[PDB]
Amino acid sequence: QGCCTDPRCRYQCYK
């Protein structure tokens, strides 16, 4: 929602 949307965090989110 917040960081998950970002690319830098998306890596961690592993969507």
**8 burial via Cβ count (<10 Å: 0-12, 13-18, 19+):** exposed
Dihedral over alpha carbons 8, 11, 1, 6 (to 10 degrees): 20
| Angle (nearest 5°) at CA 12 between 9 and 14 | 110
User: What are the backbone dihedrals phi and psi of residue 4, each rounded to the nearest 5 degrees, phi first?
Assistant: -55, -30
CA distance 15 to 8: 12
For residues 15 and 9, the answer to whether their CB atoms sit within 8 Å is: no
Experimental method: NMR
Q: Which two tokens stand for residue 7?
A: 């690319």
